[PDB]
């Protein structure tokens, strides 16, 4: 429960996230058309891989999530970090393609990656 | 069972799908060589992400799939939609890179995404 | 256990793998800068998809992994194949982008893909 509770919710978000944004980018791509080209391309793949390792990591301490400890918060903020980070980006075809923005997204993937990873594993 | 039954099968397909097609594209890429360049590149990533969110969504109502309701059919046709959709595409390096074809694939990802997602979640 | 044991470990590796390598490439990309451009781009996506289907396949005989038979070894060497394969590659922006190296990585994905896939499925 506690467990299912966690994963679905994060992912659902995550997947409302990645979902609007995917078809959406598709939809805008053709609609914009071009700068928006990479913009859209761009959203997909950073995010697609935000998710891609989200998926690795979440999905797994998922079904290996024994300890009672509260860790979902990061499942939760890493989402929270990464969304506003893309969203912050968020149209500049010029590099920078990054910023404090992703010092948030990636780097939280990193922190919440790092701890929780190690956590349900070594236990 | 009913459950395992579902996921493996869809994925197996899905993964026979994504699998021939991956090494295959590799194999053809070098063999064609060039137009086939993006063609192959092309197959991977639409499909790679067909799968990528397949994976998100399937995999999860997977292990959160309680209701008796018949929903696998779409696991099943969204595959059925997406394969023939790429396959329909399926060599034009000119945009369009889409069509009624993906009005099928993506959009079923969308429908079968949308309902089943919400379904085992809100329950 | 035996099961959890398996998946986490492979993935952890896999995910220490894909993880250093992702932020890392990011980090080097900006730092190199350019040839390193595709190099880094390059690492991500072969590997990102090494993982991408790893994820499909591992993750699933994962929770459908009944037989006692020893199959983790490949979870294990396919990792072992693929790492040293990228790593072998591993800076040439000239094609070849492949070699005996990936005759290892991909092709083990293939062998260990192929058998274990079929195995916990048909059972
Ligand atoms: C609950 C907390 C108690 C107190 C709350 C009070 C907090 C109030 C914060 C007030 C802030 C004051 C504003 C100063 C900021 C100026 C920033 C700036 O100049 O831009 C930098 C710019 C710099 O831009 P740039 O010029 O480098 O590039 C832009 C791109 N070009 C140039 C191509 C156009 O960086 C960004 O754009 C980042 C975007 C920030 C987006 C912020 C929106 C998200 C905020 C989330 C939190 C909000 C509440 C959610 C709560 C939900 C509740 C559960
Ligand atoms: C943008 C900036 C960068 C962002 C990148 C990523 C984010 C980085 C995160 C960094 C780590 C932050 C550290 C916080 C934790 C440190 C505190 C600590 O250790 O104290 C002990 C811990 C543990 O609790 P305790 O140990 O004090 O309690 C003792 C009770 N016994 C021993 C009997 C069990 O305290 C907490 O952290 C509690 C925090 C709870 C969070 C607040 C919400 C609780 C309510 C739940 C529902 C609320 C709705 C929210 C839903 C959100 C919807 C979107
Ligand atoms: C069981 C049902 C009862 C009745 C079955 C009877 C159904 C019989 C349907 C007969 C159809 C009549 C044909 C008219 C169609 C003409 C289409 C056309 O012109 O092409 C559009 C074209 C338009 O092309 P275009 O010109 O825009 O671009 C092509 C690309 N260039 C130009 C670069 C070369 O679009 C497509 O290519 C789509 C490809 C369609 C592929 C169809 C094969 C898959 C069909 C799956 C179902 C088959 C059975 C599976 C059953 C399994 C059983 C469990
Ligand atoms: C290319 C075009 C776009 C494609 C994109 C994606 C596809 C879009 C899908 C859109 C939705 C379609 C709606 C269909 C459902 C609506 C019907 C409905 O609501 O009625 C009630 C529902 C529910 O059943 P019921 O409620 O009528 O039964 C009552 C019994 N009690 C109450 C006691 C439990 O009926 C059905 O849908 C039954 C359909 C079953 C499907 C037919 C096959 C059954 C046999 C199984 C094995 C067959 C082998 C197949 C293997 C395939 C291999 C590849
Ligand atoms: C335990 C076993 C018992 C015996 C152990 C004894 C084994 C000892 C093997 C000794 C080998 C002798 C060396 C001859 C090889 C020459 C290769 C060559 O020329 O390069 C080809 C080259 C050809 O290069 P190229 O010229 O086509 O392209 C390079 C790119 N450019 C040109 C752009 C610069 O291919 C490679 O680079 C492949 C890289 C190989 C990397 C090997 C390191 C990994 C080895 C893993 C095993 C090690 C132990 C791990 C054990 C862990 C324990 C649990
Ligand atoms: C770079 C080159 C390409 C690489 C690409 C991918 C790799 C390709 C792999 C190809 C397949 C290789 C075939 C090997 C198996 C064939 C042998 C066989 O069938 O015999 C019967 C099998 C089965 O056992 P058995 O059937 O003989 O035992 C009988 C006992 N009863 C019947 C009662 C149950 O034997 C084995 O394979 C045992 C091998 C075990 C592996 C050795 C290690 C065991 C110790 C565990 C801990 C060690 C630490 C290691 C951790 C690693 C850390 C990173
Ligand atoms: N989907 C791509 C995203 C790559 C990307 O957007 N790279 C950014 C940094 S994370 C960059 O600076 N690219 C170089 C460029 O735009 O020229 C991947 O997985 O590699
Ligand atoms: N793998 C790429 C696929 C992108 C792609 O093929 N985009 C299509 C629409 S879905 C397109 O029209 N691209 C613009 C172009 O080809 O110039 C991604 O995930 O973004
Ligand atoms: N992430 C890309 C990787 C594609 C790639 O690196 N292709 C290699 C073979 S696996 C190649 O030879 N590309 C053609 C080129 O570099 O011009 C994908 O998923 O398609
Ligand atoms: C329960 C899991 C939620 C699944 C949503 C999948 C959306 C995919 C985003 C790409
Ligand atoms: C919900 C996530 C929204 C992501 C918006 C990303 C903005 C793109 C910036 C490039
Ligand atoms: C049981 C799951 C089936 C796994 C097949 C994986 C194939 C990967 C396709 C890329
Ligand atoms: C099994 C799926 C086959 C996919 C074929 C895709 C055709 C590519 C069109 C571009
Ligand atoms: C237990 C599973 C291990 C999760 C590590 C995820 C790292 C992601 C790599 C991209
Ligand atoms: C741990 C995996 C390390 C991968 C190194 C890949 C080398 C890139 C070659 C291109």
Domain residue spans of chain A: 1-123
Are the CB atoms for A85 and A100 separated by under 8 Å? no
Sign of CA dihedral A80, A82, A86, A88: positive
Three-state SS at C121: helix
By the CB < 8 Å criterion, does C37 face chain A? no
Cβ(A5)–Cβ(A58) below 8 Å: no
Structure tokens at C60: 């699933």
Half-sphere exposure of A79 (CA within 13 A, CB side): 20
Handedness of CA A78, A81, A85, A87 (dihedral sign): positive
Nearest C-alpha neighbor of B103 from the set C111, A27, C2, A52: A27
How far apart, in whole angstroms, are the C-alpha atoms of residue C51 and residue C61? 15
For B35, which DSSP code?
Answer: T
Q: Cβ C56–B18 below 8 Å, yes or no?
A: yes
Query: Least CA distance to A45: which residue of chain B?
Result: B49
In degrees rounded to 5, what are phi and psi of residue B99? 170, -165
Least CB–CB distance from C117: residue in B15, B48, B63: B15
Asked if the bond preceding C101 is cis, omega within 30° of 0, the reply is no
Protein residues with CB under 6 Å of any ligand 7 atom: A 42, 45-46, 49, 95, 97-98; C 26, 29, 41, 44-45
- Cα C58 off chain centre by: 11
Q: What kind of experiment solved this structure?
A: electron diffraction
Residue having the nearest C-alpha atom to atom 14 of ligand 7: C37
Contact A8 B113 (CB under 8 A): no
Under 8 Å between Cβ of C55 and B53: no
Distance CA(A6)–CA(A40), nearest Å, equals 30
Domain A1-123, CATH among 1.10.3720.10, 3.60.20.10, 1.20.120.550, 3.90.1140.10:
1.20.120.550
Say how far residue B92 (Cα) sits from the centre of its chain.
20
- Letter string b/e over residues B54-81, b meaning 16 or more CB atoms within 10 A of that residue's CB: bbbbbbbbbbbbeeeeebbebbeebbbb
Q: Are C78 and C55 in contact (CB under 8 A)?
A: no
| Interatomic CA distance for residues A52 and C69, integer angstroms | 30
**Chains A, C: CB pairs < 8 Å:** 39
């Amino acid at each position: 429960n506690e467990v299912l509770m966690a994963f679905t919710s994060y992912a659902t978000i995550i997947l409302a996230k990645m979902m609007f944004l995917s078809s959406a980018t598709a939809f805008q791509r053709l609609t914009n058309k071009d700068e928006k080209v990479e913009r859209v391309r761009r959203a997909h793949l950073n995010d697609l891989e935000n998710i891609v390792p989200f998926l690795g990591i979440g999905l797994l301490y998922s079904l290996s999530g024994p300890d009672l400890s509260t860790a979902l918060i990061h499942f939760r903020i890493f989402v929270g970090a990464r969304i506003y980070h893309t969203i912050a980006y968020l149209t500049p075809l010029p590099q920078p393609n990054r910023g404090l923005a992703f010092f948030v997204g990636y780097g939280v993937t990193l922190s919440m990656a790092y701890r929780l990873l190690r956590s349900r594993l070594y236990l």
